[PDB]
Write a protein that binds this ligand. Structure first.
Ligand SMILES: C[C@@H](NC(=O)C1C=CC=NC1=O)C1CC1
Ligand SMILES: C[C@@H](NC(=O)C1C=CC=NC1=O)C1CC1
Length: 150
């Protein structure tokens, strides 16, 4: 009973979380997941400021109200070569990665590793935070409050 959560650097508090190496998070799961990191789904304004500090990914993830990809450099296979906060307009499907916003993070680029999941609750799952540099932090718990996400 295991969940891997791959996380990035934080940029003005915003970071990306990919679960189990594939698009697998619903909107309800995303809010609960960010809550376990003492975080929330970013607003569009918080995501635009994170972009301006150096944040970009090549993966769709929830923010408040939309599913987006922040892009700095144009790449043909990432958000159809767009730059800026690219908003997903048309999709048949409901599961993506998520972004999260932690208000206590540093104001600009924070590429230190994540070593805590401070607000997870009691549960049976081995949850492992995987940083980009491979360092890991694991704890037994749960973060999903909606049964349909379990
Ligand atoms: C939840 C937050 N991490 C932390 O607050 C700590 C605190 C102490 C030690 N390690 C952490 O990752 C993640 C968003 C960045
Ligand atoms: C407690 C410890 N770590 C942190 O505060 C954080 C916060 C966010 C992300 N990673 C951390 O290690 C301080 C010594 C460095």
């Amino acid at each position: 009973n295991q969940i891997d959560l791959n996380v990035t650097c934080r940029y003005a508090g915003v970071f990306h979380v990919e679960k189990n190496g594939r698009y697998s998070i619903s909107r309800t799961e995303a809010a609960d997941l960010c809550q376990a990191f003492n975080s929330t789904l970013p607003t569009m304004d918080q995501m635009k400021l994170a972009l301006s500090k150096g944040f970009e990914t090549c993966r769709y993830g929830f923010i408040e109200g939309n599913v987006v990809i922040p892009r700095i450099h144009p790449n043909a296979i990432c958000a159809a070569n767009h730059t800026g906060v690219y908003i997903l307009v048309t999709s048949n499907t409901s599961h993506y990665d998520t972004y999260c916003f932690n208000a206590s993070a540093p104001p600009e680029e924070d590429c230190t590793s994540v070593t805590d999941l401070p607000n997870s609750f009691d549960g049976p799952v081995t949850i492992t935070i995987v940083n980009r540099d491979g360092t890991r932090y694991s704890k037994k718990g749960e973060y999903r409050t909606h049964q349909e996400d379990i």
